[PDB]
């Protein structure tokens, strides 16, 4: 087939009163890209390279 957190969160209002949880709401180095003429194999993250801060660093 294959065409939400499900936690304490889905309690609509809830509100114990005292409790808020209101803090949630959420290249230079030494010429890394300067040497971009480098031919075949390279460090960095051309694409599909999850842990380089893209959706990761958060």
């Amino acid at each position: 087939y294959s065409a939400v957190t499900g936690n304490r969160y889905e309690d609509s209002s809830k509100i114990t009163g005292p409790f808020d949880m209101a803090e949630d709401k959420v290249i230079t180095g030494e010429g890394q890209s300067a040497g971009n003429i480098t031919g075949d194999d390279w460090d960095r993250g051309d694409k599909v390279t999850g842990t380089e801060g893209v959706s990761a660093r958060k």
Partner: protein
Amino acid sequence: MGIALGMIETRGLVPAIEAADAMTKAAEVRLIGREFVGGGYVTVLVRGETGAVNAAVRAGADACERVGDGLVAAHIIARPHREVEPALGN
């Protein structure tokens, strides 16, 4: 001995009782006391760590709206003060 305090208001004893049951079922948190406020108001008071209390209170609020009169109040105390402790059986 998590100090975080959850406590729920219900109109009638029923929603208070299944509120306590939901408190216990959602997380292994302890109830410190049930109180008959008066005028039909019944209140449940549970203790535990903040996250477990939050999850339990959310579950109880979910489970009590439909049964009986439903909720009256529901909120979470993360750090009850020492001055409030004598209200909890000094």
